[PDB]
Structures are given as structure tokens and as C-alpha cells.
Amino acid sequence: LVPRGSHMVMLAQQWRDARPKVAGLHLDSGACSRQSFAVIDATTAHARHEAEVGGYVAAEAATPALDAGRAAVASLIGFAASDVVYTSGSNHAIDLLLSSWPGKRTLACLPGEYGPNLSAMAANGFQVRALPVDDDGRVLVDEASHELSAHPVALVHLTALASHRGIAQPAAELVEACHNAGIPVVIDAAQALGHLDCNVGADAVYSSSRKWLAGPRGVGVLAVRPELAERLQPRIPPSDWPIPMSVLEKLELGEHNAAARVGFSVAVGEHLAAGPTAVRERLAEVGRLSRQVLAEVDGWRVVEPVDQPTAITTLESTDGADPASVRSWLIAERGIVTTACELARAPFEMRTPVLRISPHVDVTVDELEQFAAALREAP
Template sequence: MSLAQQWADARPKVAGLHFDSGACSRQSLAVIDAVAAHARHEAEVGGYVAAEAAAPVLEAGRAAIAALTGLDATDVVFTSGSNHSLDLLLGSWVGERTLACLPGEFGPNLAVMAANGFQVRALPVDGDGRIVVDEVARQFASGPPALVHFTALASHRGVAQPLAEMVAVCRAAGVPIVVDGAQAFGHLDCSIGADAIYSSSRKWLAGPRGVGFLAVRPELVARLQRRVPPVEWDVPVTVLQSFEHGEHNAAIRIGYSVALGEHLAAGPELVRARLAEVGRTARQVLADVPGWCVVEGVDEPTAITTLEPTDEADPVAVRAWLIAERGIVTTACELARAPFEMTKPLLRISPHVDTTAEDLEQFAEVLRDVP
């Protein structure tokens, strides 16, 4: 049985066409059942007892994240999602607050950087928004920032960044690199040993909403300062332990751990190859749809395809019409998504491994009929 069929069979039947995995993928029945089973166990024995019983599942989840990031399981903490992870990390940084990132940085990430008092400068990119690694190395030789924040795959453009090469440049310059893996994790190869990496559960890993992870190398942890409890309190709580301090939803962390296990069982390399195939097919099928221009090159190794309107089409209105009239879920990328790079709204599709060529051809036909 093909990977696409296995993935589809593991889930409830989709209502229409789901091309929105970059926002929120469809969970498997096993993930749904694991979340429900833990909630039931909490009702039977109490939340804290149930959480203790689930500790091995969560440790397996941390080990899976470690395997997919090139870090250790002891470097991994669960969070409520990507923005939460970035806020925890930047809020604990005690050094100079200068940071370099891509011009197309995700708007909410920029807001977190500003809220934590970071001065941001743009990294050099080419016309496709891809980092120019050699130029970065030259810039860092004369004046490196305190931190690099690197979004390996943007949410408004399906361009895969040269992640391993960028990590190598930062390591040579002695600049810690924090990787936003929200779109890349489970989609591209993230096992590159970054100083820190974070992501959400709900996107390409197809776990529950409201959970994510942050993984930080010990060398970078040593440069952070605990915020809660206050550092002057003499209590045996490490920085990473403090990141998991407080209330959380244990059930969805368990669901995420199950989704991570499913991803490893499917074969991360096979998943990446299939996603690249889906993206290539999507760009070929959509290339000639009147009124829209495919932004990415056809062989970009991602499943994210963005469409720029060439007439007066409004992606927000088109998205709403597609859902209401045809049961097709896409994303409208507005300017706030990448405020320093985008010049007009885009329509994005982000299909997963179960999407067929027939599904994409159906979408192309419907897109031709949008009023």
C-alpha cells in the first residue's frame, strides 16, 4: 500500500478537499483516540496520576523530536506552539539583543522579537527570498549579530532555505542560530543540529492544536536566564524545566507524541519525497490557470504552492468562496504574514501526502470558475 493511501486510511474521510496542512493538518484516528483516552483516564484517576502514567509516552515524543532535529531528548521541552516557544527563548536571553532574520520573516515572530526588545536586521536574500549564504558569511565577519533567527520554510512562500549551510555559517562565526521549524518540521530535513529549533504540532506532523516543542542545545541554555521562578530564588529548577512550568494540556502532548511516532514509522525521507512530489504536481497543474501566477519554481522541494492574482481577484474572498461553495480549504496569505516582504495578498495551498493529481486537477477547474 502506498504512503498516500496509508495516510488517508489512518484518518476520518475528508469532507471535500483539504489543502491547508501549512495551517492545520488532519489528525489520525490514533491521535484522536490517544487524546480522548488520556482525558478519560484523568476522569478515572485524576489528572496528576494520569500524567505520571503517561510519562513514557511523552519521553518517546521527546526522543522522536530529538531524532528529527539532531539534538538530544534532554534538550526538548513541550510548549503550547511556535510563538510560545520563541517568546520563552527570547525572553530568557541575557546578552545583547540584536538579531538577524530573513526579510520575509513571519509577522507574529517579528512581534515577539519586538516585545522582547530585540533590534532586528535583515539577512541578504536573492530574488526568490532565499538566503545568500556567502554574503551572510561576509557580513558576519565584519559585524555579527548576537543571534540569528532563521525560518527554514516560510508560510507565505514555498521556498526551501539552505538550512544546513546556514547553520554551518553561523557556527563558524560563533553566532547562535534559532530555527523556526513551524513549516519545515516534518516537511524538510531538520536534523542539522541547530542551537535551538522550535515548531508546532498541528502542521505537517498532523498532531493536535495547542502544543509544540522547543529544543535548545546545552551551550545555548547556559546563556539563558530563568524567568519563572525568579532567578534570585534558590530553587532547583533549570531553565528548560522552567519552560514547562505551569498549567498545560497533557492529553494533546500525548496526541503529539503519537503523531511523531506515526511520522517516524512512515519514514521521514519518504514523507519528504512525497511532499515534494505533491508540490511539483500542484505547480504543474496550476501553471496555466487564468488570473493566477504560481510563485514557486516547479521543482522547489516543498508542498507549499502560492498563487499570486494577476487580475482583481481577492485571495481572502476566494478562500471563503472555495470553502462555502466547494468544500475546498486553502489559506489566504495577507500582508501581515510577512509585512517586510509581501506586496499583495496570495492564495496558498499546502496539501499533504494523500493528495492526488486528480484532487489538484479538480481544484484547478474550480479555480477557473471562481466568480
């Protein structure tokens, strides 16, 4: 570890300038990022259009934008546009899928599985087994391969990037291992979409608008391969359904904020326009710089290996400080936005809570140093 300087990318500056000026310092795009002026305007415009021509007329007329959003998402995950459906977010997504699941309801997932995912799993009558992982919580693909062949399961649920830790999971290799054992794979890409390469052959993928794609809140996407989709049995309407519609049409049924969905379509568009690979390489870099700058802070140790290709960095207190209090202090006294991850976020992995930073492409080394500095003089 001989420190390395930051790459200069105009991407960072373009991205900062495309969105409102931050009041203080925002290191929290893993919780909720920042909508561009274009995304905010497109949302506002739809709401105005609803008033001028009627809400549903407006919605019909927005079909091109909506479909473009499906198509953009589809391209990032290697699906077809018509496999992609809108939701309220990722927890909505997993519930739609698991509540629709036919036959034996068993699955395997990581021990670091997201608390509310486990909640949805249990609530849908699933039996849940842990996959083998190393000390960082990263799946051991070979071991998992053998385990799944001997002791199969109805599906594997992989959270490719966890909310509580910035480890990038070997999604692609695990997918082919599961497919070799004849088991479909669902991916929670709430953190991963717009961040990791999510084109990995999965059978279903879901994600949230408001995180790395910097879309409006209250939107998510769920993508399901046609072979799987047609096997599914939605909860509403009941399977003796007089109205004839496809599974995906049923899963997309319901009042929603249409303006926010067109907002989202603009946001994914901005990601494609910026260059997915370039954005991801930059986020990997942000993580490296973060872990380098924060390597030497009294009372905090960096959890992630330095070279993890993610922008999520988590800090564990070494003298029993409470992340939640530090976050409140950082906001109130320094205007620095972070997230405090409680144990409930990953109850079968986390033994102690952590402070999480999740900066986007626009963060500077100076800003990371300001955070480090503020973290030292915290009471």
C-alpha cells in the first residue's frame, strides 16, 4: 500500500453540475442520491401534463419514455425490455416475486442478506439457508456449487452488493454454478444497478430508482425471464382471475406516481449516456480513495478491502461509538450526510453497527479529507 493519486475524469464535474448544489457534503448516494435538473423537470412536466390533458391520457402519451426506461434497464441486466416491470422499489419487488412463487418455497442466500429481504422471505413462507462465504461475507462459488448439487433449493437469492458492506459479490460465477445445478437465481441489485456489471445471466433482477441511478423516490424495477415469469402465480388478482392478463401485467398493476417513473426513465438514460463502464470504473475508484483517506483515523477501522470495485465504504468504531449519533452530529454540526447501518440491516452477519459512506462520481479527495477530519473531532 503505497498511496495512489485520483484519476481526473470530467464525468465527475459534469455529474455535479447537472444537479442542485449540495448544501453541505453528501456522501450518501447508497441511501438516496441526487436527481438531475432534467429528472426533476421531467417529473414536474408530467404532473403539469396530467392537469392539461388528463392523468391517464398523459400516462398513455408517456409510454415511449416509460418503455425506454424498461429498455435501458434491460440492456444493463441483459434481459429484454418486455421482461421489465415498474415497482415502488426493491422491497416491493422481492415481495411481488416471492409471493408469486409456485411449488416448494425454499431458497439459499448470503448470511449478509438484507434484513427486510429476510422479512419478506419469511412472510412468504420460504425456508432460508445460508450460502458458504469467506470472512468478508463474499460467497465461495466452488463450495456453493457442491452444496447446491447435493442439497438443491427452489431458488438462490443473491444480493450482489449489500447495503451494509461494499463487497462486490461474484454474481456471474455464482449464476452459472446455480444454473449447472438447475436452480434459478434472483438478484437484489438495489445497490448494484448502476454500480456493478449486472449483466450476469440471472433469472430475475430488481433495483431501486433513488440510489446510484439517481432517479426519483418511490420507483423500482423488477425483471423476470419469460420462462420463469409464466410459471409464476400472482397473489392479486387470485389465480382464478376473470380478467385475462399476463403475469408481468398483474405484477405491474396498481396506482403509482407515473411522473416519477418518467423521471426514472430520464435517470437511466443519463447513466447510459454517461457510459456505464466509465461510471462503474469511477465508482470503484471512489471506493479506493475513500478507504485510503480513511485508513488512518483514530477510533474507526475500514471494513472493506481497499481494492473492492464499489463506492461503499463502512467504518466500525474501535472504542464503542454509536454510528447513529455520529451521523446526527455530522449532519447537524458539519452538514455531512452519511448512513448509520444498524444490526437489523444484516442480522446474520453484522455483530456490530457501522457508519457507511456512499459518495457518487463527483466526490473529491479534499471532500473525503474533510469527512476524515470531521470524524476525528466528533464528540
